[PDB]
Amino acid sequence: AVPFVEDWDLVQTLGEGAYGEVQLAVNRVTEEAVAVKIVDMKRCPENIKKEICINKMLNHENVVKFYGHRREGNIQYLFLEYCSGGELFDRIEPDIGMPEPDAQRFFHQLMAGVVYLHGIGITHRDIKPENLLLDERDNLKISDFGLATVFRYNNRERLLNKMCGTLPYVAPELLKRREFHAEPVDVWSCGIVLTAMLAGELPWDQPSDSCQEYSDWKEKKTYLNPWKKIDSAPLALLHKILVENPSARITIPDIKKDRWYNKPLKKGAKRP
Numbered sequence: 001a002v003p004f005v006e007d008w009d010l011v012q013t014l015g016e017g018a019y020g021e022v023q024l025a026v027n028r029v030t031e032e033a034v035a036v037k038i039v040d041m042k043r044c045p046e047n048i049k050k051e052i053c054i055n056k057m058l059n060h061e062n063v064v065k066f067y068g069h070r071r072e073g074n075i076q077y078l079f080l081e082y083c084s085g086g087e088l089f090d091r092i093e094p095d096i097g098m099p100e101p102d103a104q105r106f107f108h109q110l111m112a113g114v115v116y117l118h119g120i121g122i123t124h125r126d127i128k129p130e131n132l133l134l135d136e137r138d139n140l141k142i143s144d145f146g147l148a149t150v151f152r153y154n155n156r157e158r159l160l161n162k163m164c165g166t167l168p169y170v171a172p173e174l175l176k177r178r179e180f181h182a183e184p185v186d187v188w189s190c191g192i193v194l195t196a197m198l199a200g201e202l203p204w205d206q207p208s209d210s211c212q213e214y215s216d217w218k219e220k221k222t223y224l225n226p227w228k229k230i231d232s233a234p235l236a237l238l239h240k241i242l243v244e245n246p247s248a249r250i251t252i253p254d255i256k257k258d259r260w261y262n263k264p265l266k267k268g269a270k271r272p
């Protein structure tokens with residue numbers, strides 16, 4: 001009945017990527033703010049159709065909400081939850097990181113999102129601080145399901161063989177093996193995000209034997225740059241996450257049992 005409720009004003013650009021651009025859209029009547037992902041199909045018709053498909057399945061507090069999609073000619077418009085706090089990346093101070101209580105709360109919320117995704121049989125495949133967005137209250141939301149896929153369907157696990165993600169966040173098995181389980185890969189990337197949050201630096205360019213920094217970690221040289229700035233409790237968790245063998249790697253149910261994970265560190269809202 002409301003005459004102008006369907007109208008949305010494109011106020012400002014939020015960022016320009018490879019697929020296209022993301023714009024801030026504000027409703028004409030309600031003044032509700034949403035983000036619109038603009039992707040040129042004529043300048044990928046395959047990777048975007050799967051992104052919409054996965055987004056349709058998801059409904060969680062730590063996952064960027066999907067409102068709908070419009071197919072105006074060639075351009076695909078993806079209406080998503082606006083996260084005003086920006087990326088977790090910009091909350092990480094270079095070579096220092098962030099306060100340990102902040103990192104723990106972000107990691108808690110990250111695990112909550114990943115648990116949900118894995119429970120519905122989907123893997124993100126590109127977990128990194130650039131893809132972890134913050135809302136008005138600093139709540140973490142997992143974003144960008146353009147590289148995501150189904151790893152469990154009708155209670156049968158499908159092994160992955162496609163190499164994707166981001167090299168510094170990638171698990172060693174996807175560079176080493178033809179086939180690999182989906183879940184430990186996401187777990188590994190979550191560990192690299194934790195390292196970044198607590199040290200303000202990435203441990204290695206890639207998890208390979210040719211990489212000196214990765215070889216030092218396997219040699220347990222925790223006296224070196226990233227690990228020496230972390231602290232024993234969270235480092236002990238990192239020792240369990242960043243395990244080369246994905247079969248010996250800690251699972252999320254066991255991460256929730258970890259000492260540092262359950263260590264009281266963070267207070268609530270400021271007098272509220």
Ligand SMILES: OCCNc1ncnc2oc(-c3ccccc3)c(-c3ccccc3)c12
Pocket residue numbers: 014015016022035037064080081082083084085086087133143144
């Ligand atoms: O879901 C992926 C689309 N991206 C977004 N989705 C949903 N909400 C968002 O808020 C942002 C954003 C918010 C505040 C400042 C800057 C960016 C962005 C944003 C857009 C482009 C590149 C990186 C981040 C964003």
